[PDB]
Amino acid sequence: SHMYLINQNGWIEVICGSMFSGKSEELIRRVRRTQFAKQHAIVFKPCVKAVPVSASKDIFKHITEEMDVIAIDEVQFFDGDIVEVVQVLANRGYRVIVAGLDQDFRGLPFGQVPQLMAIAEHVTKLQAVCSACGSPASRTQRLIDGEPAAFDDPIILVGASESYEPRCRHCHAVPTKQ
Amino acid sequence: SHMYLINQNGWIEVICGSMFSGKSEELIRRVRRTQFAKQHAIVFKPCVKAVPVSASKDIFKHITEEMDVIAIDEVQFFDGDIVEVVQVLANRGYRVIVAGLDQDFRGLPFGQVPQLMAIAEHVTKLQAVCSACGSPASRTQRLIDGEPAAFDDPIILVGASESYEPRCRHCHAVPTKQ
Amino acid sequence: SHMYLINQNGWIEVICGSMFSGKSEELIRRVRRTQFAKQHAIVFKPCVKAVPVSASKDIFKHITEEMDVIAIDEVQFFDGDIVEVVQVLANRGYRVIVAGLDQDFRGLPFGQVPQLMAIAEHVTKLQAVCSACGSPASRTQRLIDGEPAAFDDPIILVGASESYEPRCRHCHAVPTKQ
Amino acid sequence: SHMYLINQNGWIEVICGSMFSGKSEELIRRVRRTQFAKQHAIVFKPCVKAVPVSASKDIFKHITEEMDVIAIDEVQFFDGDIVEVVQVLANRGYRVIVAGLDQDFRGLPFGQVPQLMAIAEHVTKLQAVCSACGSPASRTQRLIDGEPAAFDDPIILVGASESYEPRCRHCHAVPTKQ
Ligand SMILES: Cc1cn([C@H]2C[C@H](O)[C@@H](CO)O2)c(=O)[nH]c1=O
Ligand SMILES: Cc1cn([C@H]2C[C@H](O)[C@@H](CO)O2)c(=O)[nH]c1=O
Ligand SMILES: Cc1cn([C@H]2C[C@H](O)[C@@H](CO)O2)c(=O)[nH]c1=O
Ligand SMILES: Cc1cn([C@H]2C[C@H](O)[C@@H](CO)O2)c(=O)[nH]c1=O
Numbered sequence: 165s166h167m168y169l170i171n172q173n174g175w176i177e178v179i180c181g182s183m184f185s186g187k188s189e190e191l192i193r194r195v196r197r198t199q200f201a202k203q204h205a206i207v208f209k210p211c212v213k214a215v216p217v218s219a220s221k222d223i224f225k226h227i228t229e230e231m232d233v234i235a236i237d238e239v240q241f242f243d244g245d246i247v248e249v250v251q252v253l254a255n256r257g258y259r260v261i262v263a264g265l266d267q268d269f270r271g272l273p274f275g276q277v278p279q280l281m282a283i284a285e286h287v288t289k290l291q292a293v294c295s296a297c298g299s300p301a302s303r304t305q306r307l308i309d310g311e312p313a314a315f316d317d318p319i320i321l322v323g324a325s326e327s328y329e330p331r332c333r334h335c336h337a338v339p340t341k342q
Numbered sequence: 343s344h345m346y347l348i349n350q351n352g353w354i355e356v357i358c359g360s361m362f363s364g365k366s367e368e369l370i371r372r373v374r375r376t377q378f379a380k381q382h383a384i385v386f387k388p389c390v391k392a393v394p395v396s397a398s399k400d401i402f403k404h405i406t407e408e409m410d411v412i413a414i415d416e417v418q419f420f421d422g423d424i425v426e427v428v429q430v431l432a433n434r435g436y437r438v439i440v441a442g443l444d445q446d447f448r449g450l451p452f453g454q455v456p457q458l459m460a461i462a463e464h465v466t467k468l469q470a471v472c473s474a475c476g477s478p479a480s481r482t483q484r485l486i487d488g489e490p491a492a493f494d495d496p497i498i499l500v501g502a503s504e505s506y507e508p509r510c511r512h513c514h515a516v517p518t519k520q
Numbered sequence: 521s522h523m524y525l526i527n528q529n530g531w532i533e534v535i536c537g538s539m540f541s542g543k544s545e546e547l548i549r550r551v552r553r554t555q556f557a558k559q560h561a562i563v564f565k566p567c568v569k570a571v572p573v574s575a576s577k578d579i580f581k582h583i584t585e586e587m588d589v590i591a592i593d594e595v596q597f598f599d600g601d602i603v604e605v606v607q608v609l610a611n612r613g614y615r616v617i618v619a620g621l622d623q624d625f626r627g628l629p630f631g632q633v634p635q636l637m638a639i640a641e642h643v644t645k646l647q648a649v650c651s652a653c654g655s656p657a658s659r660t661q662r663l664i665d666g667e668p669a670a671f672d673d674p675i676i677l678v679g680a681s682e683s684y685e686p687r688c689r690h691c692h693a694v695p696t697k698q
Numbered sequence: 699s700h701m702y703l704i705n706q707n708g709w710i711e712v713i714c715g716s717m718f719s720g721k722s723e724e725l726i727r728r729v730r731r732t733q734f735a736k737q738h739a740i741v742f743k744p745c746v747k748a749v750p751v752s753a754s755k756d757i758f759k760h761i762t763e764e765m766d767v768i769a770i771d772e773v774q775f776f777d778g779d780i781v782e783v784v785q786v787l788a789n790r791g792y793r794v795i796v797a798g799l800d801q802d803f804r805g806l807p808f809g810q811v812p813q814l815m816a817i818a819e820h821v822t823k824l825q826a827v828c829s830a831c832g833s834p835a836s837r838t839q840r841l842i843d844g845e846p847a848a849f850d851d852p853i854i855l856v857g858a859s860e861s862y863e864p865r866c867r868h869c870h871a872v873p874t875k876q
């Protein structure tokens with residue numbers, strides 16, 4: 165015979181975009197509306213309380229039937245389970261709100277974020293303002309001593325303003341070796 | 343003869359919605375992207391610095407050719423000039439970002455906000471979560487000692503949580519005399 | 521004593537923008553999703569069937585308890601009742617979808633559209649592409665024999681391509697007498 | 699030495715969602731605004747003119763310096779090159795508009811659509827109305843003789859109403875063997 169688990173009407177909201185676009189601020193705006201309504205919310209991170217986790221499946225250990233809203237920040241960093249983990253959470257009737265980068269510094273899709281964008285009921289893509297020219301940005305520029313990082317430098321490198329900048333595609337510079 | 347002033351490509355962004363929807367937080371998110379880009383921003387209020395003003399036309403006194411972005415919060419409160427003031431600012435090439443309530447406590451259009459929504463290049467309408475039932479809110483409920491305010495009580499009454507609550511239309515209650 | 525009619529969770533969606541932005545096409549897209557779901561829809565116009573009406577209150581005569589979705593096109597043209605008419609429809613539990621111009625040819629708010637934008641749960645503002653320069657348009661330019669219409673010519677003038685064009689604010693030209 | 703090709707300010711717009719959500723209609727709305735502005739547009743499909751192509755890289759053969767806008771429908775069907783092909787088109791200064799399913803019938807990410815959603819400047823996710831319950835849909839249900847298709851049936855199966863239906867997640871049924 166065939167098996168069928170009946171999903172509940174939870175859902176997923178994805179917030180994504182380059183660094184500096186206010187993804188985390190928008191996650192928190194949404195979460196805050198939640199509290200004015202007196203719902204129970206929890207926020208997860210890698211490394212209302214914010215709870216660090218080393219694996220996606222660890223999220224389960226921290227959850228209750230009491231809880232209404234599950235937020236996860238910096239999702240690009242989450243492991244390969246994260247797609248399944250959020251699907252199951254939504255299927256259980258939770259509002260799952262998820263924020264992370266769409267693209268790494270090369271302009272390539274970051275981690276499981278594209279998959280989350282695909283399965284999500286709602287997607288919000290935020291833009292920053294380009295540092296070089298003032299028009300809408302859609303990229304994170306990595307700089308090293310003022311110089312644009314090469315296409316071959318590591319995908320993951322934890323940092324902030326000291327290494328990163330928002331740019332439109334025109335101003336985005338990712339040099340390759342020949 | 344006929345006169346013609348050539349507008350520049352400034353524009354208007356309206357952020358609106360009931361109390362508690364995060365209008366001001368979203369104004370500030372937008373303004374903050376501005377600073378990461380090193381643009382000059384100013385924020386106006388009734389009663390990056392926040393500058394109180396008693397009339398809309400007073401905004402002009404505080405502006406420069408240096409400045410790039412003009413934000414105005416709590417726009418429902420601004421006088422009858424505000425439509426013209428923002429049109430002229432945009433026409434001068436500024437990015438004008440404006441936040442205020444769409445509706446008063448009766449569910450009726452608040453101040454000049456509907457007109458601003460009409461002339462604006464961008465409109466963003468934010469929703470809170472309903473306090474009574476947990477579904478998307480689109481109204482501000484006024485309560486007085488737990489009781490829903492009558493349709494005849496003043497349009498303007500400055501307050502916060504001690505008198506106000508977000509609700510969907512179903513849960514919104516505005517009683518009338520007979 | 522005080523009276524209170526309990527609203528149902530109907531709602532309003534406003535679609536607005538300059539001529540040529542595809543307001544009517546988007547109204548119909550939405551309406552069409554409705555039919556794939558086997559809901560009962562009706563469309564109203566001034567002058568699934570499209571039904572002309574000379575007054576807003578006339579809409580009532582054409583409605584049923586069977587019906588689920590009420591669409592109204594060219595709302596700028598509707599009389600002063602239209603705000604109340606749509607509020608009551610929503611309050612009765614209908615999905616009310618409404619399309620019309622945000623601005624007349626002068627760049628001023630058109631009819632009751634700003635009020636509808638204020639009371640609506642959802643607002644969608646569509647942009648066309650500017651004819652003069654190719655960037656996003658937000659205005660309807662009126663031309664008469666190639667020449668930009670004066671600020672004093674009538675507010676209402678029924679027409680299409682033979683008199684009208686979409687423009688950004690920079691390219692929008694509304695001359696005034698001196 | 700290192701190589702650097704300077705991108706132009708073209709961009710990508712993704713339109714996605716379940717079957718029946720009006721993706722193609724919205725592609726055409728956008729394309730049509732283009733024509734009112736007198737820009738040169740072309741539309742591509744798998745199998746203003748609509749041009750069938752068997753490989754993504756074939757798109758190049760059909761393009762000019764004259765052309766301004768490149769639309770591609772049913773993108774889930776396009777091969778592994780499509781991400782690169784659209785990146786390069788945007789990088790060359792074209793407005794690239796792309797429409798396809800976010801999810802296959804199992805609720806899993808379809809083809810290269812998630813990657814396109816990640817690299818795109820704009821993402822629009824459209825919802826249909828659920829056939830079973832009338833609330834917003836976010837899934838395509840596959841039915842075979844009235845019965846929900848198993849999780850193991852082929853990923854690709856060309857069809858329309860005779861096999862497919864839009865549903866919310868609650869009503870979506872994808873049975874598995876045990
Ligand atoms: C753009 C980018 C950011 N990051 C990191 C830097 C920050 O710590 C984090 C985004 O907040 O992601 C990468 O690891 N790789 C990248 O390509
Ligand atoms: C909803 C509502 C708010 N307000 C006030 C209360 C707050 O001070 C402000 C919104 O932040 O507006 C009114 O004056 N009238 C109203 O109907
Ligand atoms: C822009 C504009 C359009 N119209 C009319 C022309 C069209 O018939 C209709 C929009 O489809 O509105 C006006 O009457 N006044 C205006 O200012
Ligand atoms: C939902 C779904 C649609 N399709 C096909 C059916 C249609 O021909 C096309 C969407 O228009 O994609 C699949 O091949 N697999 C799927 O899972």
Ligand SMILES: [Zn+2]
Pocket residue numbers: 294295296297298299331332333334335336
């Ligand atoms: Zn730039």
Ligand SMILES: [Zn+2]
Pocket residue numbers: 472473474475476477509510511512513514
């Ligand atoms: Zn409610």
Ligand SMILES: [Zn+2]
Pocket residue numbers: 650651652653654655687688689690691692
């Ligand atoms: Zn223009």
Ligand SMILES: [Zn+2]
Pocket residue numbers: 828829830831832833865866867868869870
């Ligand atoms: Zn359903």
